[PDB]
Protein backbone atom coordinates (compact mmCIF):
# COMPACT_ATOMS: atom_id res chain seq x y z
CA UNK A 1 0.00 0.00 0.00
CA UNK A 2 3.20 2.04 0.35
CA UNK A 3 5.71 0.01 -1.65
CA UNK A 4 9.49 0.40 -1.87
CA UNK A 5 11.05 -1.05 -5.02
CA UNK A 6 14.58 -2.26 -4.31
CA UNK A 7 17.46 -1.84 -6.76
CA UNK A 8 20.91 -3.34 -6.18
CA UNK A 9 23.71 -2.13 -8.44
CA UNK A 10 27.10 -3.77 -8.87
CA UNK A 11 28.96 -6.31 -6.76
CA UNK A 12 28.85 -4.16 -3.61
CA UNK A 13 25.16 -3.45 -4.12
CA UNK A 14 24.41 -7.12 -4.75
CA UNK A 15 26.14 -8.31 -1.57
CA UNK A 16 24.59 -5.56 0.57
CA UNK A 17 21.17 -6.33 -0.90
CA UNK A 18 21.58 -10.06 -0.23
CA UNK A 19 22.46 -9.33 3.40
CA UNK A 20 19.54 -6.88 3.74
CA UNK A 21 17.03 -9.39 2.36
CA UNK A 22 18.48 -12.04 4.68
CA UNK A 23 17.88 -9.65 7.59
CA UNK A 24 14.29 -8.70 6.85
CA UNK A 25 13.27 -12.23 5.85
CA UNK A 26 14.06 -13.25 9.43
CA UNK A 27 12.34 -10.07 10.62
CA UNK A 28 9.11 -11.06 8.83
CA UNK A 29 9.50 -14.79 9.53
CA UNK A 30 10.24 -16.19 6.07
CA UNK A 31 12.03 -19.50 5.50
CA UNK A 32 14.68 -19.91 2.75
CA UNK A 33 11.99 -21.53 0.59
CA UNK A 34 9.72 -18.49 0.81
CA UNK A 35 6.74 -19.48 2.94
CA UNK A 36 5.75 -18.02 6.30
CA UNK A 37 6.27 -19.71 9.69
CA UNK A 38 5.88 -17.19 12.51
CA UNK A 39 4.28 -16.67 15.89
CA UNK A 40 2.55 -13.27 15.60
CA UNK A 41 -0.32 -11.86 13.55
CA UNK A 42 1.41 -8.49 13.04
CA UNK A 43 4.00 -9.97 10.66
CA UNK A 44 1.55 -10.28 7.73
CA UNK A 45 -0.41 -7.06 8.29
CA UNK A 46 2.15 -4.98 6.36
CA UNK A 47 4.11 -7.42 4.20
CA UNK A 48 3.28 -6.03 0.74
CA UNK A 49 5.76 -3.20 1.40
CA UNK A 50 8.76 -5.35 0.42
CA UNK A 51 7.29 -8.71 -0.63
CA UNK A 52 5.11 -9.91 -3.49
CA UNK A 53 2.54 -12.68 -3.11
CA UNK A 54 2.92 -15.94 -5.01
CA UNK A 55 0.91 -19.16 -5.05
CA UNK A 56 0.83 -21.62 -2.18
CA UNK A 57 1.53 -18.98 0.45
CA UNK A 58 4.92 -17.85 -0.84
CA UNK A 59 6.52 -14.40 -0.86
CA UNK A 60 9.21 -13.09 -3.22
CA UNK A 61 11.12 -9.80 -2.78
CA UNK A 62 10.43 -6.71 -4.89
CA UNK A 63 14.10 -6.35 -5.79
CA UNK A 64 15.97 -5.92 -9.08
CA UNK A 65 19.58 -7.12 -9.12
CA UNK A 66 21.94 -5.51 -11.65
CA UNK A 67 25.49 -6.43 -12.63
CA UNK A 68 27.88 -6.28 -15.56
CA UNK A 69 29.64 -9.52 -14.54
CA UNK A 70 27.79 -12.83 -13.95
CA UNK A 71 30.15 -14.06 -11.21
CA UNK A 72 28.60 -11.98 -8.44
CA UNK A 73 25.13 -13.00 -9.62
CA UNK A 74 26.18 -16.65 -9.40
CA UNK A 75 27.61 -16.03 -5.92
CA UNK A 76 24.38 -14.34 -4.77
CA UNK A 77 22.24 -17.13 -6.24
CA UNK A 78 24.32 -19.89 -4.62
CA UNK A 79 24.02 -18.28 -1.18
CA UNK A 80 21.85 -19.35 1.76
CA UNK A 81 18.80 -17.20 0.95
CA UNK A 82 19.43 -17.18 -2.80
CA UNK A 83 16.32 -19.16 -3.74
CA UNK A 84 13.82 -16.43 -2.84
CA UNK A 85 14.68 -13.96 -5.62
CA UNK A 86 12.72 -14.34 -8.84
CA UNK A 87 14.99 -15.71 -11.61
CA UNK A 88 13.81 -13.00 -14.04
CA UNK A 89 15.05 -10.10 -11.87
CA UNK A 90 18.76 -10.95 -12.26
CA UNK A 91 20.05 -8.66 -15.02
CA UNK A 92 23.71 -9.36 -15.75
CA UNK A 93 25.82 -8.33 -18.70
CA UNK A 94 28.47 -10.54 -20.24
CA UNK A 95 31.41 -8.10 -20.26
CA UNK A 96 32.43 -6.20 -17.15
CA UNK A 97 32.78 -2.46 -16.71
CA UNK A 98 36.42 -2.86 -15.68
CA UNK A 99 36.35 -0.04 -13.08
CA UNK A 100 35.49 2.59 -15.69
CA UNK A 101 32.77 5.20 -15.29
CA UNK A 102 32.74 5.84 -19.05
CA UNK A 103 32.27 2.10 -19.64
CA UNK A 104 29.41 2.13 -17.15
CA UNK A 105 27.75 5.29 -18.45
CA UNK A 106 28.14 5.37 -22.22
CA UNK A 107 29.51 2.18 -23.80
CA UNK A 108 28.40 -0.91 -21.86
CA UNK A 109 25.78 0.58 -19.54
CA UNK A 110 23.73 2.07 -22.38
CA UNK A 111 22.30 -1.24 -23.64
CA UNK A 112 21.61 -3.01 -20.33
CA UNK A 113 19.39 -0.19 -19.07
CA UNK A 114 16.49 -0.94 -21.41
CA UNK A 115 16.37 -4.51 -20.08
CA UNK A 116 16.70 -3.21 -16.51
CA UNK A 117 13.98 -0.57 -16.98
CA UNK A 118 11.57 -3.16 -18.38
CA UNK A 119 11.67 -5.05 -15.07
CA UNK A 120 11.72 -1.80 -13.08
CA UNK A 121 8.62 -0.49 -14.87
CA UNK A 122 6.70 -3.75 -14.48
CA UNK A 123 7.52 -3.88 -10.75
CA UNK A 124 6.54 -0.22 -10.35
CA UNK A 125 3.24 -0.66 -12.20
CA UNK A 126 2.33 -3.82 -10.27
CA UNK A 127 2.13 -1.87 -6.98
CA UNK A 128 -1.02 -0.45 -5.42
CA UNK A 129 0.20 2.99 -4.31
CA UNK A 130 3.96 3.18 -4.81
CA UNK A 131 5.93 4.89 -2.05
CA UNK A 132 9.37 5.02 -3.62
CA UNK A 133 12.52 3.51 -5.05
CA UNK A 134 15.61 2.45 -3.11
CA UNK A 135 19.11 1.95 -4.51
CA UNK A 136 22.21 0.33 -3.00
CA UNK A 137 25.51 1.00 -4.75
CA UNK A 138 29.13 2.12 -4.40
CA UNK A 139 30.82 5.11 -6.02
CA UNK A 140 34.22 3.43 -6.25
CA UNK A 141 33.34 1.02 -9.05
CA UNK A 142 32.09 0.96 -12.61
CA UNK A 143 28.74 -0.84 -12.58
CA UNK A 144 27.47 0.64 -9.31
CA UNK A 145 28.14 4.29 -10.13
CA UNK A 146 28.50 4.45 -13.91
CA UNK A 147 25.22 2.73 -14.71
CA UNK A 148 23.51 3.35 -11.37
CA UNK A 149 23.55 7.11 -11.93
CA UNK A 150 22.03 6.65 -15.39
CA UNK A 151 19.31 4.43 -13.91
CA UNK A 152 18.66 7.10 -11.26
CA UNK A 153 18.36 9.81 -13.93
CA UNK A 154 15.96 7.79 -16.09
CA UNK A 155 13.82 6.80 -13.08
CA UNK A 156 13.66 10.44 -11.98
CA UNK A 157 12.60 11.43 -15.50
CA UNK A 158 9.84 8.82 -15.59
CA UNK A 159 8.48 9.16 -12.01
CA UNK A 160 9.03 12.73 -10.76
CA UNK A 161 6.65 12.80 -7.77
CA UNK A 162 8.16 9.82 -5.96
CA UNK A 163 10.87 9.17 -3.36
CA UNK A 164 14.41 8.23 -4.39
CA UNK A 165 16.59 6.90 -1.57
CA UNK A 166 20.17 5.85 -2.20
CA UNK A 167 22.81 4.16 -0.06
CA UNK A 168 26.16 5.23 -1.50
CA UNK A 169 29.40 3.57 -0.40
CA UNK A 170 31.59 6.66 -0.83
CA UNK A 171 35.39 6.35 -1.23
CA UNK A 172 37.60 5.97 1.83
CA UNK A 173 40.72 8.13 2.33
CA UNK A 174 43.02 5.41 3.72
CA UNK A 175 41.35 2.18 2.54
CA UNK A 176 41.40 3.18 -1.16
CA UNK A 177 42.49 0.17 -3.22
CA UNK A 178 41.66 1.49 -6.72
CA UNK A 179 43.34 4.31 -8.61
CA UNK A 180 40.47 5.66 -10.78
CA UNK A 181 38.27 5.80 -7.69
CA UNK A 182 38.35 9.64 -7.35
CA UNK A 183 37.47 9.93 -11.06
CA UNK A 184 34.40 7.73 -10.60
CA UNK A 185 33.39 9.50 -7.37
CA UNK A 186 33.70 13.01 -8.80
CA UNK A 187 31.76 12.08 -11.92
CA UNK A 188 29.00 10.46 -9.81
CA UNK A 189 28.40 13.17 -7.16
CA UNK A 190 27.21 15.60 -9.86
CA UNK A 191 24.42 13.16 -10.74
CA UNK A 192 23.53 12.42 -7.11
CA UNK A 193 23.34 16.13 -6.25
CA UNK A 194 20.97 16.92 -9.13
CA UNK A 195 18.51 14.01 -9.31
CA UNK A 196 18.22 12.35 -5.89
CA UNK A 197 15.81 12.90 -3.00
CA UNK A 198 17.87 11.32 -0.18
CA UNK A 199 21.48 10.10 -0.11
CA UNK A 200 23.09 8.23 2.78
CA UNK A 201 26.90 8.20 2.78
CA UNK A 202 28.40 4.98 4.15
CA UNK A 203 32.16 4.54 4.47
CA UNK A 204 34.18 1.33 4.72
CA UNK A 205 36.83 2.86 6.99
CA UNK A 206 34.15 3.87 9.49
CA UNK A 207 32.54 0.42 9.22
CA UNK A 208 35.92 -1.19 9.98
CA UNK A 209 36.43 1.23 12.88
CA UNK A 210 33.08 0.32 14.45
CA UNK A 211 33.62 -3.40 13.83
CA UNK A 212 37.02 -3.26 15.54
CA UNK A 213 36.79 -0.73 18.38
CA UNK A 214 33.15 -1.27 19.40
CA UNK A 215 32.03 -4.78 18.46
CA UNK A 216 35.51 -6.17 19.30
CA UNK A 217 35.54 -8.87 16.63
CA UNK A 218 38.70 -10.80 15.81
CA UNK A 219 37.70 -11.16 12.13
CA UNK A 220 35.60 -8.28 10.72
CA UNK A 221 34.50 -9.78 7.42
CA UNK A 222 32.19 -8.26 4.81
CA UNK A 223 29.27 -10.13 6.38
CA UNK A 224 29.83 -8.12 9.55
CA UNK A 225 30.29 -4.99 7.43
CA UNK A 226 27.00 -5.51 5.58
CA UNK A 227 24.98 -6.42 8.69
CA UNK A 228 25.63 -2.89 9.97
CA UNK A 229 24.22 -1.39 6.75
CA UNK A 230 21.24 -3.77 6.72
CA UNK A 231 20.31 -2.79 10.28
CA UNK A 232 20.05 0.86 9.23
CA UNK A 233 18.06 -0.09 6.13
CA UNK A 234 15.60 -1.96 8.34
CA UNK A 235 15.41 0.82 10.92
CA UNK A 236 14.77 3.65 8.48
CA UNK A 237 11.64 1.95 7.04
CA UNK A 238 10.38 0.05 10.11
CA UNK A 239 7.65 2.69 10.59
CA UNK A 240 6.00 1.64 7.32
CA UNK A 241 5.67 -2.02 8.28
CA UNK A 242 5.11 -1.92 12.01
CA UNK A 243 2.69 0.05 14.22
CA UNK A 244 3.86 2.57 16.76
CA UNK A 245 3.03 5.53 18.96
CA UNK A 246 4.54 8.18 16.66
CA UNK A 247 4.97 7.01 13.08
CA UNK A 248 7.22 8.67 10.51
CA UNK A 249 7.73 7.47 6.94
CA UNK A 250 10.48 8.33 4.45
CA UNK A 251 8.50 11.24 3.01
CA UNK A 252 8.10 12.78 6.47
CA UNK A 253 11.79 12.28 7.28
CA UNK A 254 12.80 13.91 3.98
CA UNK A 255 10.44 16.86 4.59
CA UNK A 256 11.80 17.46 8.09
CA UNK A 257 15.47 16.89 7.22
CA UNK A 258 15.95 18.53 3.80
CA UNK A 259 15.69 22.34 3.95
CA UNK A 260 16.94 22.94 0.39
CA UNK A 261 16.87 20.52 -2.58
CA UNK A 262 20.67 20.51 -3.03
CA UNK A 263 21.30 19.48 0.61
CA UNK A 264 20.42 15.78 0.93
CA UNK A 265 23.63 14.03 2.08
CA UNK A 266 23.15 12.28 5.41
CA UNK A 267 25.27 10.33 7.89
CA UNK A 268 23.91 7.17 9.50
CA UNK A 269 24.44 5.30 12.82
CA UNK A 270 22.94 2.31 14.75
CA UNK A 271 22.41 2.33 18.50
CA UNK A 272 22.75 -0.87 20.41
CA UNK A 273 26.11 -2.29 19.45
CA UNK A 274 27.88 -4.10 22.27
CA UNK A 275 30.31 -6.97 22.66
CA UNK A 276 29.58 -10.41 24.08
CA UNK A 277 32.06 -10.01 26.94
CA UNK A 278 31.05 -6.42 27.73
CA UNK A 279 27.25 -6.67 27.53
CA UNK A 280 26.90 -7.72 31.18
CA UNK A 281 28.29 -4.37 32.37
CA UNK A 282 25.78 -2.23 30.44
CA UNK A 283 22.02 -1.79 30.74
CA UNK A 284 20.89 -0.56 27.32
CA UNK A 285 18.07 1.92 27.96
CA UNK A 286 17.06 5.18 26.25
CA UNK A 287 19.93 7.35 27.64
CA UNK A 288 22.45 4.71 26.51
CA UNK A 289 20.82 4.56 23.06
CA UNK A 290 20.88 8.35 22.66
CA UNK A 291 24.45 8.50 23.98
CA UNK A 292 25.69 5.87 21.53
CA UNK A 293 23.84 7.51 18.63
CA UNK A 294 25.33 10.93 19.32
CA UNK A 295 28.84 9.61 20.01
CA UNK A 296 31.00 10.81 17.10
CA UNK A 297 32.77 7.44 16.85
CA UNK A 298 29.51 5.71 15.86
CA UNK A 299 29.10 7.51 12.51
CA UNK A 300 29.15 5.30 9.43
CA UNK A 301 30.93 7.99 7.39
CA UNK A 302 34.56 9.10 7.67
CA UNK A 303 33.57 12.61 8.77
CA UNK A 304 33.78 14.00 12.29
CA UNK A 305 30.70 16.11 13.16
CA UNK A 306 32.70 18.12 15.71
CA UNK A 307 34.21 20.09 12.81
CA UNK A 308 30.81 21.22 11.53
CA UNK A 309 27.26 22.12 12.57
CA UNK A 310 24.30 19.74 12.68
CA UNK A 311 21.84 21.10 10.12
CA UNK A 312 19.10 18.62 11.07
CA UNK A 313 18.94 15.39 13.10
CA UNK A 314 16.37 12.60 12.93
CA UNK A 315 16.11 9.43 14.98
CA UNK A 316 13.80 6.41 14.83
CA UNK A 317 13.50 4.41 18.05
CA UNK A 318 12.19 0.83 18.09
CA UNK A 319 10.57 -1.08 20.93
CA UNK A 320 8.24 -0.36 23.81
CA UNK A 321 9.41 2.79 25.59
CA UNK A 322 8.06 5.88 27.32
CA UNK A 323 7.86 9.06 25.27
CA UNK A 324 8.86 11.33 28.17
CA UNK A 325 12.42 9.96 28.20
CA UNK A 326 12.55 10.06 24.39
CA UNK A 327 11.65 13.75 24.33
CA UNK A 328 13.77 14.55 27.40
CA UNK A 329 17.08 13.18 26.10
CA UNK A 330 16.72 14.91 22.73
CA UNK A 331 15.93 18.21 24.41
CA UNK A 332 18.89 17.73 26.78
CA UNK A 333 21.43 17.12 24.01
CA UNK A 334 20.35 20.35 22.26
CA UNK A 335 20.56 22.22 25.56
CA UNK A 336 24.06 20.88 26.27
CA UNK A 337 25.58 21.32 22.79
CA UNK A 338 24.72 24.92 21.92
CA UNK A 339 27.45 25.57 19.34
CA UNK A 340 27.09 22.30 17.39
CA UNK A 341 23.62 23.17 16.03
CA UNK A 342 22.74 25.83 13.47
CA UNK A 343 20.89 28.76 15.00
CA UNK A 344 18.49 29.59 12.15
CA UNK A 345 16.46 26.40 12.74
CA UNK A 346 14.95 25.86 16.21
CA UNK A 347 14.39 22.27 17.37
CA UNK A 348 16.78 20.61 14.93
CA UNK A 349 15.92 17.11 16.22
CA UNK A 350 13.01 14.91 15.08
CA UNK A 351 11.84 11.81 16.96
CA UNK A 352 9.93 8.75 15.78
CA UNK A 353 8.86 5.67 17.75
CA UNK A 354 7.99 2.18 16.48
CA UNK A 355 6.63 -0.61 18.67
CA UNK A 356 8.18 -3.89 17.46
CA UNK A 357 11.92 -4.32 18.22
CA UNK A 358 14.42 -5.95 15.82
CA UNK A 359 15.61 -9.54 16.10
CA UNK A 360 17.31 -10.44 19.36
CA UNK A 361 16.73 -7.12 21.15
CA UNK A 362 14.03 -5.37 23.14
CA UNK A 363 14.87 -1.72 22.39
CA UNK A 364 16.85 -0.12 19.58
CA UNK A 365 17.43 3.21 17.86
CA UNK A 366 18.70 4.64 14.58
CA UNK A 367 20.20 8.09 13.91
CA UNK A 368 20.33 10.01 10.62
CA UNK A 369 22.21 13.29 10.64
CA UNK A 370 22.27 16.07 8.06
CA UNK A 371 25.50 17.83 9.03
CA UNK A 372 27.69 20.47 7.41
CA UNK A 373 30.83 18.42 8.20
CA UNK A 374 30.06 16.31 5.10
CA UNK A 375 31.77 19.01 2.98
CA UNK A 376 35.23 17.75 4.00
CA UNK A 377 34.44 14.50 2.16
CA UNK A 378 33.82 16.41 -1.08
CA UNK A 379 36.89 18.58 -0.47
CA UNK A 380 39.06 15.46 -0.05
CA UNK A 381 37.65 13.91 -3.23
CA UNK A 382 38.26 17.20 -5.07
CA UNK A 383 41.86 17.54 -3.90
CA UNK A 384 42.56 13.95 -4.96
CA UNK A 385 40.81 14.54 -8.31
CA UNK A 386 42.78 17.69 -9.19
CA UNK A 387 46.16 16.08 -8.46
CA UNK A 388 45.57 13.39 -11.08
CA UNK A 389 43.72 15.66 -13.50
CA UNK A 390 46.45 18.30 -13.83
CA UNK A 391 48.95 15.68 -15.01
CA UNK A 392 46.22 14.06 -17.20
CA UNK A 393 46.84 10.68 -15.57
CA UNK A 394 44.49 7.82 -16.53
CA UNK A 395 42.64 10.10 -18.95
CA UNK A 396 42.84 8.06 -22.16
CA UNK A 397 40.64 5.31 -20.68
CA UNK A 398 37.91 7.93 -20.23
CA UNK A 399 38.44 10.07 -23.34
CA UNK A 400 38.60 7.14 -25.76
CA UNK A 401 34.97 6.26 -25.01
CA UNK A 402 33.13 9.37 -26.20
CA UNK A 403 33.96 11.68 -23.30
CA UNK A 404 35.43 15.18 -23.40
CA UNK A 405 37.76 17.06 -21.06
CA UNK A 406 35.04 19.68 -20.43
CA UNK A 407 32.95 17.23 -18.38
CA UNK A 408 35.75 16.82 -15.83
CA UNK A 409 36.05 20.61 -15.52
CA UNK A 410 32.31 21.03 -15.01
CA UNK A 411 32.31 18.22 -12.42
CA UNK A 412 35.05 20.09 -10.55
CA UNK A 413 33.09 23.34 -10.77
CA UNK A 414 29.85 21.82 -9.46
CA UNK A 415 31.68 20.08 -6.60
CA UNK A 416 33.28 23.43 -5.71
CA UNK A 417 29.87 25.10 -5.78
CA UNK A 418 28.47 22.37 -3.52
CA UNK A 419 31.20 22.83 -0.90
CA UNK A 420 30.82 26.62 -1.21
CA UNK A 421 27.09 26.47 -0.50
CA UNK A 422 27.68 24.16 2.48
CA UNK A 423 30.25 26.64 3.82
CA UNK A 424 27.89 29.59 3.31
CA UNK A 425 25.09 27.75 5.10
CA UNK A 426 27.50 27.04 7.95
CA UNK A 427 28.93 30.55 8.39
CA UNK A 428 25.55 32.28 8.24
CA UNK A 429 23.99 34.61 10.80
CA UNK A 430 20.37 34.12 11.80
CA UNK A 431 19.50 37.68 12.90
CA UNK A 432 19.53 39.35 9.47
CA UNK A 433 17.43 40.08 6.40
CA UNK A 434 20.21 40.04 3.85
CA UNK A 435 19.21 41.59 0.51
CA UNK A 436 15.95 40.02 -0.72
CA UNK A 437 13.65 41.43 1.99
CA UNK A 438 13.60 44.91 0.46
CA UNK A 439 9.79 44.70 0.30
CA UNK A 440 9.57 46.82 3.47
CA UNK B 1 -15.58 -16.93 49.21
CA UNK B 2 -15.59 -20.62 48.25
CA UNK B 3 -17.08 -19.77 44.84
CA UNK B 4 -14.49 -17.03 44.31
CA UNK B 5 -11.68 -19.40 45.31
CA UNK B 6 -13.10 -22.11 43.02
CA UNK B 7 -13.14 -19.82 39.98
CA UNK B 8 -9.69 -18.39 40.78
CA UNK B 9 -8.21 -21.88 41.18
CA UNK B 10 -9.66 -22.89 37.80
CA UNK B 11 -8.13 -19.78 36.20
CA UNK B 12 -4.73 -20.42 37.82
CA UNK B 13 -4.62 -24.06 36.66
CA UNK B 14 -5.59 -22.98 33.13
CA UNK B 15 -2.79 -20.39 33.08
CA UNK B 16 -0.25 -22.94 34.37
CA UNK B 17 -1.21 -25.39 31.62
CA UNK B 18 -0.95 -22.59 29.04
CA UNK B 19 2.64 -21.82 30.10
CA UNK B 20 3.48 -25.55 30.10
CA UNK B 21 2.17 -25.90 26.53
CA UNK B 22 4.16 -22.85 25.37
CA UNK B 23 7.36 -24.22 26.93
CA UNK B 24 6.76 -27.59 25.25
CA UNK B 25 6.29 -25.92 21.84
CA UNK B 26 9.52 -23.92 22.22
CA UNK B 27 11.39 -27.10 23.19
CA UNK B 28 9.92 -28.91 20.16
CA UNK B 29 11.11 -26.15 17.81
CA UNK B 30 14.64 -26.21 19.27
CA UNK B 31 14.89 -30.02 19.03
CA UNK B 32 13.68 -30.03 15.42
CA UNK B 33 16.22 -27.38 14.39
CA UNK B 34 19.07 -29.23 16.13
CA UNK B 35 18.24 -32.62 14.59
CA UNK B 36 17.88 -31.16 11.08
CA UNK B 37 21.26 -29.41 11.37
CA UNK B 38 22.97 -32.55 12.71
CA UNK B 39 21.54 -34.81 9.99
CA UNK B 40 22.52 -32.45 7.16
CA UNK B 41 26.07 -32.03 8.50
CA UNK B 42 26.42 -35.82 8.83
CA UNK B 43 25.22 -36.33 5.24
CA UNK B 44 27.70 -33.74 3.95
CA UNK B 45 30.50 -35.45 5.91
CA UNK B 46 29.62 -38.81 4.32
CA UNK B 47 29.54 -37.19 0.87
CA UNK B 48 33.00 -35.67 1.38
CA UNK B 49 34.24 -39.05 2.66
CA UNK B 50 33.13 -40.66 -0.61
CA UNK B 51 34.64 -37.73 -2.51
CA UNK B 52 38.10 -38.11 -0.99
CA UNK B 53 28.64 -45.49 -8.78
CA UNK B 54 27.10 -48.28 -6.72
CA UNK B 55 26.36 -46.05 -3.70
CA UNK B 56 26.99 -42.48 -4.89
CA UNK B 57 24.13 -42.81 -7.38
CA UNK B 58 21.83 -44.13 -4.65
CA UNK B 59 22.71 -41.43 -2.10
CA UNK B 60 21.34 -38.67 -4.37
CA UNK B 61 17.81 -39.10 -2.93
CA UNK B 62 18.70 -37.61 0.46
CA UNK B 63 15.70 -35.64 1.80
CA UNK B 64 16.06 -31.87 1.93
CA UNK B 65 16.25 -29.66 5.01
CA UNK B 66 12.53 -28.92 4.65
CA UNK B 67 11.64 -32.62 4.85
CA UNK B 68 14.09 -33.04 7.74
CA UNK B 69 12.39 -30.20 9.64
CA UNK B 70 8.85 -31.37 8.84
CA UNK B 71 7.37 -28.99 6.24
CA UNK B 72 5.77 -30.56 3.16
CA UNK C 1 59.84 -24.93 37.12
CA UNK C 2 57.27 -22.34 38.22
CA UNK C 3 54.59 -20.60 36.15
CA UNK C 4 53.24 -18.54 39.07
CA UNK C 5 55.14 -15.36 38.19
CA UNK C 6 55.58 -15.61 34.40
CA UNK C 7 53.63 -13.07 32.37
CA UNK C 8 50.80 -14.47 30.25
CA UNK C 9 48.67 -13.29 27.33
CA UNK C 10 47.50 -9.68 27.48
CA UNK C 11 43.87 -8.61 27.26
CA UNK C 12 44.46 -4.91 26.52
CA UNK C 13 47.74 -4.62 24.59
CA UNK C 14 47.28 -6.67 21.39
CA UNK C 15 43.60 -7.24 20.60
CA UNK C 16 44.36 -9.57 17.71
CA UNK C 17 44.21 -13.24 16.83
CA UNK C 18 47.08 -15.74 16.54
CA UNK C 19 47.56 -15.52 20.32
CA UNK C 20 44.84 -17.83 21.70
CA UNK C 21 44.02 -21.35 20.58
CA UNK C 22 40.76 -22.54 19.07
CA UNK C 23 38.10 -20.61 17.20
CA UNK C 24 36.79 -17.49 18.96
CA UNK C 25 34.57 -14.88 17.31
CA UNK C 26 34.96 -12.21 20.02
CA UNK C 27 37.81 -10.74 22.03
CA UNK C 28 38.58 -12.18 25.46
CA UNK C 29 37.81 -9.19 27.77
CA UNK C 30 36.70 -11.55 30.56
CA UNK C 31 39.41 -10.95 33.18
CA UNK C 32 40.43 -14.59 33.78
CA UNK C 33 44.08 -15.40 33.05
CA UNK C 34 45.96 -18.68 32.76
CA UNK C 35 47.92 -18.48 36.02
CA UNK C 36 45.01 -17.06 38.04
CA UNK C 37 44.25 -20.42 39.68
CA UNK C 38 47.82 -21.13 40.80
CA UNK C 39 48.31 -17.48 41.81
CA UNK C 40 45.18 -17.59 43.99
CA UNK C 41 46.24 -20.94 45.50
CA UNK C 42 49.78 -19.80 46.36
CA UNK C 43 49.01 -16.18 47.34
CA UNK C 44 45.75 -15.85 49.31
CA UNK C 45 44.12 -12.45 49.82
CA UNK C 46 42.58 -12.32 53.31
CA UNK C 47 41.60 -8.88 54.73
CA UNK C 48 44.47 -6.65 55.91
CA UNK C 49 46.28 -5.18 58.93
CA UNK C 50 43.02 -3.97 60.51
CA UNK C 51 40.10 -6.14 61.86
CA UNK C 52 40.30 -9.52 63.70
Amino acid sequence: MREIVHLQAGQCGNQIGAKFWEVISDEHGIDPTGTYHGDSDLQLERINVYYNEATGGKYVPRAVLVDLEPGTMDSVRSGPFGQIFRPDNFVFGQSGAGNNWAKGHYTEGAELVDSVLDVVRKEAESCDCLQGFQLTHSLGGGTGSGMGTLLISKIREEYPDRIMNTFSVVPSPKVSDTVVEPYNATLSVHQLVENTDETYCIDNEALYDICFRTLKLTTPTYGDLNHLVSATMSGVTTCLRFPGQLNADLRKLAVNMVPFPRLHFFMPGFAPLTSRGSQQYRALTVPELTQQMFDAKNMMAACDPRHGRYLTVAAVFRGRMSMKEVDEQMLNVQNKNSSYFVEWIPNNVKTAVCDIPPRGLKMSATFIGNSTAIQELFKRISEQFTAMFRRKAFLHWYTGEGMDEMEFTEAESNMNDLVSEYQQYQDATAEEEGEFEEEA
Amino acid sequence: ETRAKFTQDNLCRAQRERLASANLRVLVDCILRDTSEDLRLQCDAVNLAFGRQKCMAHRTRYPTILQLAGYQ
Amino acid sequence: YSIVHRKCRSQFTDLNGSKRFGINTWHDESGIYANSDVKQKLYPLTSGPIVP
Binding site: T218, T219, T221 | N47, T60 | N16, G17, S18, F21, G22
Partner: peptide, 25 residues
Protein backbone atom coordinates in the same frame (compact mmCIF):
# COMPACT_ATOMS: atom_id res chain seq x y z
CA UNK D 1 24.50 -31.65 -5.73
CA UNK D 2 26.76 -28.94 -7.13
CA UNK D 3 24.92 -26.35 -5.04
CA UNK D 4 25.37 -28.43 -1.88
CA UNK D 5 29.05 -28.86 -2.77
CA UNK D 6 29.33 -25.07 -2.97
CA UNK D 7 27.57 -24.77 0.42
CA UNK D 8 29.95 -27.22 2.08
CA UNK D 9 32.98 -25.54 0.47
CA UNK D 10 31.64 -22.28 1.92
CA UNK D 11 31.41 -23.92 5.35
CA UNK D 12 34.95 -25.34 5.09
CA UNK D 13 36.44 -22.00 4.06
CA UNK D 14 34.47 -20.38 6.90
CA UNK D 15 36.14 -22.77 9.35
CA UNK D 16 39.61 -22.12 7.88
CA UNK D 17 39.21 -18.33 7.86
CA UNK D 18 37.68 -18.15 11.35
CA UNK D 19 40.41 -20.27 12.91
CA UNK D 20 42.35 -17.06 13.57
CA UNK D 21 45.50 -18.77 14.84
CA UNK D 22 45.96 -20.84 11.68
CA UNK D 23 44.99 -18.06 9.24
CA UNK D 24 47.59 -15.51 10.36
CA UNK D 25 50.23 -18.00 11.51
Amino acid sequence: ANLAKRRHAELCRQKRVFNARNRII
